[PDB]
Amino acid sequence: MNQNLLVTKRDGSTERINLDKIHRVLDWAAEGLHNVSISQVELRSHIQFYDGIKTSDIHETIIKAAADLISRDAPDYQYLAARLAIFHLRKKAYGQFEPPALYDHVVKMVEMGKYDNHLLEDYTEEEFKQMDTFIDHDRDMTFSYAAVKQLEGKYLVQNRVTGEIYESAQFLYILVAACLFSNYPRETRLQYVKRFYDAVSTFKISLPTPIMSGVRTPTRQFSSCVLIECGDSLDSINATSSAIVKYVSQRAGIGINAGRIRALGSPIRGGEAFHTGCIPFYKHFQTAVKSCSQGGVRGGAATLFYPMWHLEVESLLVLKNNRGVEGNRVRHMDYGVQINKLMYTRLLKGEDITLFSPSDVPGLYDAFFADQEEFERLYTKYEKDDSIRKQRVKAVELFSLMMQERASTGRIYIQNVDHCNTHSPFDPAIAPVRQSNLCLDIALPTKPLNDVNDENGEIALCTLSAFNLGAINNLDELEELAILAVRALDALLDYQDYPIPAAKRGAMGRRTLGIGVINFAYYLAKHGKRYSDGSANNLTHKTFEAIQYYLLKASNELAKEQGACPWFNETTYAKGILPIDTYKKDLDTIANEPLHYDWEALRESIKTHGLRNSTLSALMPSETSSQISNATNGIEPPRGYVSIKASKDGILRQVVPDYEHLHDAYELLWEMPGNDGYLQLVGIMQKFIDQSISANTNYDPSRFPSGKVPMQQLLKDLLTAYKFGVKTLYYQNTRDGA
């Protein structure tokens, strides 16, 4: 008759219940949302309250209650839940809802060793006072629950033992800004910090996880992926391996080119025993890749590339096929099969494909990537020469074998090596592109190492970022954003540390960046286009010309200011060649949109003052970044309207952006009748992209007689992709609802 319910506080222990405090907080969180029942939430959580429960559990419980009502039909629960979680997270880090002033926060964090001390060196208290005036902690209210789950899970600075969270998303953004523009002239430094801060807090520009979790802290390791090229020698094999180990110990995705390793049977090169072949070494790279992961299998990912005509290609192609002898399988690494014009022509004419160990055909490997003419000449030449060890395979058998394996595992990727060299930012004769990275979006020059510390080797890196096509109003907002993206990344290049000499060489030499988009799908839904009918062709053309033009304008602008990258002379850019001059011709047949930009003015501006960065665009996939922004992933159509994630904290649901008004506008992944629509769009994007795009092929067995995908369809799609100049092909998904 005074039946209370004692809440317990952070060692302040006992106290009565405050069900009106709670309601106030809920009420607040609900402000502006539509279709959310505060009572419903209260009922669901009050029922699990027990007499001496700590306050932190009252919050988790109201948070989960809200999260569990998220649905297609009631999507504002995602904000109600996030807002509660944000509120809780404030109290958890600061003891109040109101964040401490920035200077005080930074000072306390530097004493605690959670923020780099250089922050206080590079900026004055008055400078921090001013940044604080740019900050808007109410943007914390725009995150969706899944977004807060990710920030909380892997962005915000915290203690991973105790669980203690030390910061709010706005301090993350403001300090990422500050660190990246810390070396700017006092004259412009803070205007840049503010402009970027705004761009990232309002989700216009997304940034990779290592960057958002680390810049501001004492580390200097921000690598997401590297590209190493193995020479045909124990020294290189050793170096390659060494390099992989250092790089996976920093969580980087690895893309390895082991195409030149000579084939099984070849003669000993004075002490180097490659009699045994590629596989034993591949195994060795796999163990290197997995050296710093959980069981010896969990975590650490790589993709290994090799020419289609390699002598052991038929053994290589079935490396992840589970039914087979243990010794002849390297299952936990994806492969990237490298193909060019001549290979496909042999398929089309039903002729043979000749396998050869690279060791035995002088000049063939290089020609393969850099000069098709010459490749054709040496190829036919060596076919005829009977001194040369070789093997003949029916091109149809070889192609189907590879498509088959690509079909089953989903992880046998294609790389059109002529397309990456005839349509690239680089000169193939001096710095050809002979491999991709883990997710087949990166395409840069690499040189083999002779020792881990070899200064004449080159390792390519992933320096990434992305435009939210869902958060810009017109494409002319991309000029400001290109500036801010390019400048921040370029700064990062000098900010971070390089574990291997050859990886420093590549970054400082070519300053290569890979900026792409996210939210494509939602962008097309708001403009009433679809992926599979070809209705989005000109819009895509318009959107990717604007992205590329402004990126080049921003980089050109930057070279003016601070000088072109040291090896700018090895680019086609240097010679007055533009992406619009070398794209694959057939594109002309599927899109008429005219260039809206002065490419000729920029051509000269580029020839004259050069480019800060040798590459600027690359369309990578993005789960995390996309989630924080509540956006569809990179350029992929959504699988369905609500996507589910698991957690220790219950089921996380996230509804596609503006489902309310665009459910009929979206074209879900399995609603596309086939791949042509999408492959065209990828081809159009590739006109302007410097690097590559992680494109997927998707098949639904329901759509085929007897539930079997014809090898004909698989080859036709493959050839469709090559015909519209697609550089790479990534995942292949099979199924009809996920």
């Binding site: 496909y344 089309l348 149809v396 079909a407």
Partner: peptide
Amino acid sequence: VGQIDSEVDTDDLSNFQL
């Protein structure tokens, strides 16, 4: 995962233009 029908027609392909 992927269950395919491995029947290939080169005649069909033939006429394709790369």
